Amino acid sequence: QVQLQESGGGLVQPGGSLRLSCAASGFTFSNYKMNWVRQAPGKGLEWVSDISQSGASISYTGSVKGRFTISRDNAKNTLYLQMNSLKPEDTAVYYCARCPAPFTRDCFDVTSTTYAYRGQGTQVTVSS
Amino acid sequence: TASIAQARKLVEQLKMEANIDRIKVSKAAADLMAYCEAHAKEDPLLTPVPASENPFR
Amino acid sequence: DQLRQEAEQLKNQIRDARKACADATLSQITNNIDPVGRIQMRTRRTLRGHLAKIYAMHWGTDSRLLVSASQDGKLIIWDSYTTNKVHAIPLRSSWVMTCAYAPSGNYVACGGLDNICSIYNLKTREGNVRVSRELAGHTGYLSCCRFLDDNQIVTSSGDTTCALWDIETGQQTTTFTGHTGDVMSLSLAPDTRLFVSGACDASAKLWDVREGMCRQTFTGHESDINAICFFPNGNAFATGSDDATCRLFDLRADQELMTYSHDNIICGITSVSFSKSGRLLLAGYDDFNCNVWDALKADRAGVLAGHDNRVSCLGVTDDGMAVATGSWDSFLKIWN
Amino acid sequence: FSFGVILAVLASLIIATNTLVAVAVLLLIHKNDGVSLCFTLNLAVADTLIGVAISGLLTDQTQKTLCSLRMAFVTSSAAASVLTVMLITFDRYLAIKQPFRYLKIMSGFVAGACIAGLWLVSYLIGFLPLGIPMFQQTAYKGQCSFFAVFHPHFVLTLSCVGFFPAMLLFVFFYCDMLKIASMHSQQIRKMEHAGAMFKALRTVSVLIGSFALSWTPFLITGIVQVACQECHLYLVLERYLWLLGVGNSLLNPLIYAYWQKEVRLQLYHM
Amino acid sequence: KAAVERSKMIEKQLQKDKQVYRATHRLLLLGADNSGKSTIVIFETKFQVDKVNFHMFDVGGQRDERRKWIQCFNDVTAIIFVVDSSDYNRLQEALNDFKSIWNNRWLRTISVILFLNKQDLLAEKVLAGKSKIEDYFPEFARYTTPEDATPEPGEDPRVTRAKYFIRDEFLRISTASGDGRHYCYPHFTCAVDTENARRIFNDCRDIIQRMHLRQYELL
Amino acid sequence: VQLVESGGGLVQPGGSRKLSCSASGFAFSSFGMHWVRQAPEKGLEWVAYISSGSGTIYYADTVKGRFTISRDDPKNTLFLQMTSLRSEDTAMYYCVRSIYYYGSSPFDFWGQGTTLTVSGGSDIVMTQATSSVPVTPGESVSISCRSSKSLLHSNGNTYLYWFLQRPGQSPQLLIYRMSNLASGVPDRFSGSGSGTAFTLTISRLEAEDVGVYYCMQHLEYPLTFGAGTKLEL
Ligand SMILES: CC(C)c1noc(C2CCN(c3ncnc(Nc4ccc(S(C)(=O)=O)cc4F)c3[N+](=O)[O-])CC2)n1
């Protein structure tokens, strides 16, 4: 069992803030690289951010720089994401994916609906 | 309805797996012990064979 | 809706019943057996003549002849006792990933990135070797096609599906579905009525040939599964994965028994195999070497060194007297 | 007359060291396919015969036909080790100037034909002047010092005909590989600058210096001998300059063998 | 005794097959949909330049997960990468791919030839003005100013940008990893160029020359 | 699979003639060839052998120095040039094919034949005492082919072959290496033996196996046949 479960999400106002967590179990959390992925309504999947094994290297996509933050807790098997000043085009479904092949510095994921190590997702709606 | 089809056969598959019978690990582990003992003299790799009966010499 | 919560309760019941039959462990029962000691093996033969790296090999039933495949586009049949070449067959497509040998010794099969496991005839009256049939019903590449008898074959593909063919008419009979990722290997039971497969979703399944339905599902790994093989008496099997660990499962108890891991090994396993008696387990790695384990105690007892690139295939003869390993440096070696 | 203590010890290292390197090279031939290793093995064999031939002069430190044959064996051995170095340079030159046509003509048969014909030319240079009456100077007999059996005119012909034209080709070839490697590194340093917002001289100097500075002084004084008709040469002046010529055999296994890291890896392991 | 003689005649035939195998120069072509990967160049293709043979492959026949069958092409001469450098909404996706190929464990000694196709489109279709920065890919105008080359005599400074855009980010990844064992050869192309068989000829010659100079301790 | 011969006739002593064996329908370039001679009323004799690739040639002592054998693969033809003929060369000729690897079967297909009339102690001797035996439908028979030397090699297998010739056709193969059964032969013939004595038995004989039988050896290279026996009524 490599179960991944997400918590959080709901209706928000423009300029609001949300906080998300991704609890994990079934593997050693301190050997892999973790990352977030979102899917817009009626479109494909878009990579967003990732964090290294220890917490030294952090990457973002160009559209969310300056508004998103990623962090991990190796002592509790959790993954976080902080949101600030959300725009109406942020409505999507957010997942929580894991890189395979530990002790490695590349991933082959965000394929179509066939990736095994992925969560179910939570609904985020930013409109008024 | 695409996910409905995949979410119905998954539940149906799990139903026929729960109604199964299992035995104890102590009973299962003992049978593996007996087979290895009764066939210990029929393994040239475990017990080396002399060069007289070695076709790869 | 309720189709997601209902499946959650069913998983709880299966897990709960397994703990009832978990009284003792295999490790605390075999504590009175004397250890094997130290196993030393050395190379006896070296077969050379291929132009590129080697993916597959297979032993003959008589334990003297074997066949190997290479991505230069050749298929050579060797004589192991005298290192003589008997045949050489050129292929139409260079990218080949598997090969098999018929139990009766009249046919040879191969396949690869061209989505076809084709069949060759050896006992021709004109004095050469010619193609006999071509089976085409798959959508992804082929990773294993294994003979059942002189008339039907079973294949696994990279489109998450297995099939059972009929060579006389070229039409498949039964289709097995249920996996999630690419199917990487398969293994036939000694009684030839069941087989298992390992996919890239970190799970294994047990099928039956006569009916065509799934029976049990096993899951104890954390990553992709590369190799699988059966116990000699047909009641257990072992696997290898990319998390650098091998595991042993029991069909009767439907759970795990033993784990073979070491603190200095951080590379995956590419192939596994048992011995004739079933007490020793062999595995190939990406650090250019192979290890020998004590199955009943799970402690290392040997090593085989001498290859230049990673080992890709491994096999043991029918009478359990020799071991053959291929590698990416285009050489074959025979140990003891 | 203390010129015996250093000769016996000097030949001992040449025989032992060269045959140690030749073992490592031949083992790697059995582990992969490669034609460039065939010439490397031949150099180690050719440098071994120099030590064997020198070891036959410890007793000399005598007859009209005994020491005449001795002075002809050493001449052929030191001529087939110079010719092998010129063979390696031409092989390196073609693989860089014309890389596409080099992969067609080259095979294992071409290497065998070149090595076999190399030993015939070396043999003809040494044992033929034993019949030509122009060389083979007068018969004062007495002892044997390579000049009671050969004439100084023999030195004049060989140097001007073969050695000087062969030295000119060595410099020309290595002044072109230095030019090619200079422009390939110009573009590499240019890519690194946009992506963020010397070895040649030291190596070449050893190859040019070692090849030319060994046998040149021997030929320089020999040519002057003809002009003098007497300048008290073929004496202690010529009994120490010869030591340089046999000094290459202790230096070749360090440039063409101790490099090529693949070769160096086996030496440490074994 | 008569079976040993038969085995030796099989080896003479294998020797003649090795002569042809060595001068073949296999290639691998992989790109993306809507990138014009076909018109620039049917699994296999044959062409001959100066009596030299080349052979190129396309593997467009499987699913979208390729972490298993890509390990076969570990000893090809080079890899051709094609980018449709005209759209900005799908340009961040193209970068990620390149990053996975460069840093893979089994492809550490393979060089990549980069083709930036779709140049005539970006010359005028986007010059009119329908896109900007901070609304699309925010890294082609992070205060960039190169002064090492101004080709194509006659233009205002912003013509090649929409194709010059992509050049910098692929070089940021390339020069930050890989000591001396593989490089990158970017090129600019279009939909009507007839000299693309010569660029591959020249770029494959520098790969072999740079490999020999390094093992002689000259580079 | 066809083999045809051309040549022959009447020649005075001291002349010469050339023979040809044309082949079609199989891979001619991977098979060896033999020449076998049969007198008007006598046994069979071995003449010459040309291997595949023409790298090995053997001759009989009685025809050494006069006969020459050669082949040309592109045209699928075999030749036999003879000179200085005498009264001992009046016999029939055949061209035969063979192939050698691990587990194969040599001496499988024979030619048809052509007619040509014109007007030392170390070799193994193969002896068949049987010359004529009565036959009845549906009974057992026994024939023996002994030897003057041991035919068992120090690698596992012995070398003995059996042949059948009908009253008006060319001979064919029945059993190779004392134990195997040739393809297309029924399951009625069996063979057994040990070292020097060998036997051949038939369970229930029909009226389609009336003729002569032969045995040979393939251990030493000068090949020797047997006298033969008749299965007449
Ligand atoms: C053939 C080409 C490649 C070539 N281009 O240049 C040369 C040199 C000229 C020929 N060779 C020698 N010429 C002179 N003397 C030599 N040895 C020697 C032996 C005995 C005494 S002594 C104590 O008795 O007085 C002194 C000596 F100097 C040698 N030699 O090295 O054998 C080698 C190279 N070859």
For chain F, domain boundaries:
2-118, 126-230
Q: Is D184 in contact with E213 (Cβ distance < 8 A)?
A: yes
User: Going by CA atoms, what residue is nearest to atom 30 of ligand 1?
Assistant: D75
CA of F159 to the centre of ligand 1 (A): 65
Instruction: Tell me which CATH code domain F2-118 carries.
Output: 2.60.40.10
Coil vs helix vs strand at F117: strand
User: Which of B8, B9, B16, B22 should one mutate to test binding to chain C, selecting the residue with the greatest count of C CBs within 10 A?
Assistant: B22
- C305 part of contact set with chain B, CB < 8 Å: no
- Which chain E residues contact residue A114 at CB under 8 A? 63-65
Contact F127, F226 (CB under 8 A): yes
Report the greatest alpha carbon distance in chain E.
83
Contact A82, A68 (CB under 8 A): yes
**Which tokens hold the place of F123?**
């070799």
Q: Which residues line ligand 1 (CB under 6 A)?
A: D 71, 74-75, 78-79, 82-83, 125, 145-146, 158, 162-163, 215, 242, 245
Q: CA B39, CA C277: separation in Å to the nearest integer?
A: 6
Distance from the Cα of residue E103 to its chain's centroid:
15
Q: CA D39, CA C145: separation in Å to the nearest integer?
A: 47
Q: Identity (one letter) of the amino acid at E23? A: A
Burial bucket for residue C10 (CB in 10 Å: 0-12, 13-18, 19+): middle
Task: Please name the residue of chain F whose CA is at the shortest distance from the CA of residue C77.
Answer: F102
Nearest to E103 among A62, A63, A106 (CB): A106
- For C161-169, the CB contacts below 8 A with 24+ separation are C162/C186, C162/C197, C162/C207, C163/C137, C163/C138, C164/C209, C165/C135, C165/C137, C167/C119, C167/C133, C167/C135
Contact E110, E79 (CB under 8 A): yes
The single residue listed with the structure tokens 């190997």 is: C68
Q: Which atom of ligand 1 is nearest to the CA of D76?
A: 32
The single residue listed with the structure tokens 């479904």 is: A93
Q: CA F146, CA D185: separation in Å to the nearest integer?
A: 84
E137: nearest Cα among E88, E79, E83, E74: E88
A10: domain CATH number? 2.60.40.10
- For C253-257, the CB contacts below 8 A with 24+ separation are C253/B22, C253/B23, C253/B24, C253/B25, C253/B28, C253/C21, C254/B20, C254/B22, C254/C18, C254/C216, C254/C218, C255/B25, C255/C18, C255/C21, C255/C22, C256/C220, C257/B25, C257/B28, C257/B29, C257/C25, C257/C26
- D179 part of contact set with chain E, CB < 8 Å: no
Task: Identify which of D68, D146, D154 to mutate to test ligand 1's pocket (most ligand atoms within 8 A of the CB).
Answer: D146
Helix, strand, coil distribution of chain D in percent, nearest 5: 70, 0, 30
For chain E, positions 76-95, list CB contacts with chain A under 8 A. 92-93
Which residues touch B15 (CB under 8 Å, ≥6 apart)?
C10
Q: CA C311, CA C318: separation in Å to the nearest integer?
A: 21
CA distances in angstroms from D209 to C40, C232, D167, D252, E97, listed in the order given: 52, 69, 11, 13, 51
| C191 CB neighbour count, 10 Å cutoff | 7
Q: CA D238, CA D221: separation in Å to the nearest integer?
A: 8
D258: nearest Cα among D206, D208, D219: D206
The single residue listed with the structure tokens 């080099």 is: D102
Q: Identity (one letter) of the amino acid at F60? A: A
Report the half-sphere exposure of B53 (CA within 13 A, side-chain side). Answer: 5
Q: Which domains does chain C have, with CATH numbers?
A: 1-335 (2.130.10.10)
Q: Is B29 in contact with C216 (Cβ distance < 8 A)?
A: no
- Nearest-Cα distance to chain E for F54, in Å, is 11
CA distances in angstroms from C241 to C201, C221, D76, E104, listed in the order given: 11, 7, 63, 19
Contact D74, D55 (CB under 8 A): no
- E17 part of contact set with chain D, CB < 8 Å: no
- Which chain E residues contact residue C312 at CB under 8 A? none
Contact E79, E207 (CB under 8 A): no
Contact A126, A88 (CB under 8 A): yes
Q: What are phi and psi of A81, to 5 degrees?
A: -160, 125
Coil vs helix vs strand at D195: coil
Task: Please name the residue of chain B whose CA is at the shortest distance from the CA of residue C35.
Answer: B46
Residues of A with CB under 8 A from a CB of E: 47, 61-63, 65, 104-108, 111-112, 114-115
Q: CA C271, CA C285: separation in Å to the nearest integer?
A: 8
Kindly state the DSSP code that residue F158 receives in the 8-state scheme. B
CA of D75 to the centre of ligand 1 (A): 5
User: Going by CA atoms, what residue is nearest to atom 29 of ligand 1?
Assistant: D75
Chains that touch D (3 or more CB pairs under 8 A): E
User: Which of E4, E6, E10 should one mutate to test binding to chain F, selecting the residue with the greatest count of F CBs within 10 A?
Assistant: E6
Q: What are phi and psi of F80, to 5 degrees?
A: -150, 105
Residue A7 belongs to domain spanning: 3-124
The single residue listed with the structure tokens 């069909």 is: C251
CA of D25 to the centre of ligand 1 (A): 28
Q: Identity (one letter) of the amino acid at E72? A: C
Q: CA C207, CA C224: separation in Å to the nearest integer?
A: 20
F to D contact (≥3 Cβ pairs closer than 8 Å)? no
Task: Please name the residue of chain D whose CA is at the shortest distance from the CA of residue E52.
Answer: D100
| C281 CB neighbour count, 10 Å cutoff | 22
User: Going by CA atoms, what residue is nearest to atom 13 of ligand 1?
Assistant: D75
Bridge partners (DSSP) listed for residue C326: C313, C332
Q: How many inter-chain contacts (D to E, CB under 8 Å) are there?
A: 64
The angle subtended at Cα A56 by Cα A54 and Cα A57, nearest 5°, is 110
CATH of F126-230, picked from 3.60.15.10, 2.40.30.10, 3.30.450.20, 2.60.40.10, is: 2.60.40.10
Radius of gyration, CA atoms only, chain B: 24
Residues in chain D: 270
Q: CA E106, CA E75: separation in Å to the nearest integer?
A: 10
User: Which of E95, E100, E168 should one mutate to test binding to chain A, selecting the residue with the greatest count of A CBs within 10 A?
Assistant: E100
**Which tokens hold the place of C215?**
């029976």
Resolution, given in Å to one decimal, reads: 3.0
Domain count of chain A? Answer: 1
Contact D262, C308 (CB under 8 A): no
Distance from the Cα of residue D122 to its chain's centroid:
12
**Which tokens hold the place of F149?**
């030397």
| E56 CB neighbour count, 10 Å cutoff | 19
F2-118 and F126-230 share one fold? yes
C190: nearest Cα among C252, C270, C274: C274
Element (H, E) at B45: none
CA of D127 to the centre of ligand 1 (A): 13
The single residue listed with the structure tokens 């060369």 is: F89
**Which tokens hold the place of F112?**
């048809």
Coil vs helix vs strand at A99: coil
DSSP secondary structure, F162-202, as one string: EEEE-TTS--EEEEETTT---TT--TTEEEEEETTEEEEEE
Bridge partners (DSSP) listed for residue C240: C227, C246
Burial bucket for residue C207 (CB in 10 Å: 0-12, 13-18, 19+): buried
Q: Which atom of ligand 1 is nearest to the CA of D246?
A: 31
Bridge partners (DSSP) listed for residue C110: C99, C118
Contact F223, F216 (CB under 8 A): yes
| F200 CB neighbour count, 10 Å cutoff | 21
User: Going by CA atoms, what residue is nearest to atom 27 of ligand 1?
Assistant: D242
- C236 part of contact set with chain B, CB < 8 Å: yes
Q: CA D46, CA C291: separation in Å to the nearest integer?
A: 44
- Nearest-Cα distance to chain C for E70, in Å, is 11
3-state secondary structure chain C: CHHHHHHHHHHHHHHHHHHHCCCCCCCCCCCCCCCCCCCCCCEEEEECCCCCCEEEEEECCCCCEEEEEECCCEEEEEECCCCEEEEECCCCCCCEEEEEECCCCCEEEEEECCCCEEEEECCCCCCCCEEEEEECCCCCCEEEEEECCCCCEEEEECCCCEEECCCCCCCCCEEECCCCCCEEEEEECCCCCEEEEEECCCCEEEEECCCCCEEEEECCCCCCEEEEEECCCCCEEEEEECCCCEEEEECCCCEEEEEECCCCCCCCEEEEEECCCCCEEEEEECCCCEEEEECCCCCEEEEECCCCCCEEEEEECCCCCCEEEEECCCCEEEEC
Burial bucket for residue C180 (CB in 10 Å: 0-12, 13-18, 19+): middle
Nearest to E14 among C49, C53, C140 (CB): C49
Distance from the Cα of residue A22 to its chain's centroid:
8
Q: CA D220, CA E137: separation in Å to the nearest integer?
A: 73
CA of D170 to the centre of ligand 1 (A): 20
CA of D161 to the centre of ligand 1 (A): 15
Q: Which domains does chain B have, with CATH numbers?
A: 1-57 (4.10.260.10)
Question: Which method resolved this structure?
Answer: cryo-EM
Task: Identify which of D215, D239, D240 to mutate to test ligand 1's pocket (most ligand atoms within 8 A of the CB).
Answer: D215
Strands F32-38 and F44-50 come out as antiparallel
Bridge partners (DSSP) listed for residue C227: C240
User: Which of A106, A107, A109, A111 should one mutate to test binding to chain E, selecting the residue with the greatest count of E CBs within 10 A?
Assistant: A106
| D227 CB neighbour count, 10 Å cutoff | 7
Q: Where are the beta strands (DSSP E) in chain F?
A: 2-6, 10-11, 16-24, 32-38, 44-50, 57-59, 68-72, 77-83, 91-98, 114-118, 126-127, 141-144, 146-147, 160-165, 172-176, 189-194, 197-202, 212-217, 229-230
Q: Is E7 in contact with C85 (Cβ distance < 8 A)?
A: yes
Chains that touch F (3 or more CB pairs under 8 A): C, E
Which residues touch F57 (CB under 8 Å, ≥6 apart)?
F48, F49, F50, F51, F69
Strands A4-7 and C311-316 come out as unpaired
Coil vs helix vs strand at E47: strand
Nearest to C243 among A102, A114, A116 (CB): A102
Q: CA F32, CA F23: separation in Å to the nearest integer?
A: 13
User: Going by CA atoms, what residue is nearest to atom 2 of ligand 1?
Assistant: D79
Contact C314, C282 (CB under 8 A): yes
Q: CA C207, CA C229: separation in Å to the nearest integer?
A: 15
D18: nearest Cα among D258, D242, D269, D262: D258
| C302 CB neighbour count, 10 Å cutoff | 17
Q: Is E9 in contact with F53 (Cβ distance < 8 A)?
A: yes
**Which tokens hold the place of F7?**
């040549």
Q: CA C97, CA C113: separation in Å to the nearest integer?
A: 8
D41: nearest Cα among D30, D54, D52, D51: D30
| C29 CB neighbour count, 10 Å cutoff | 16
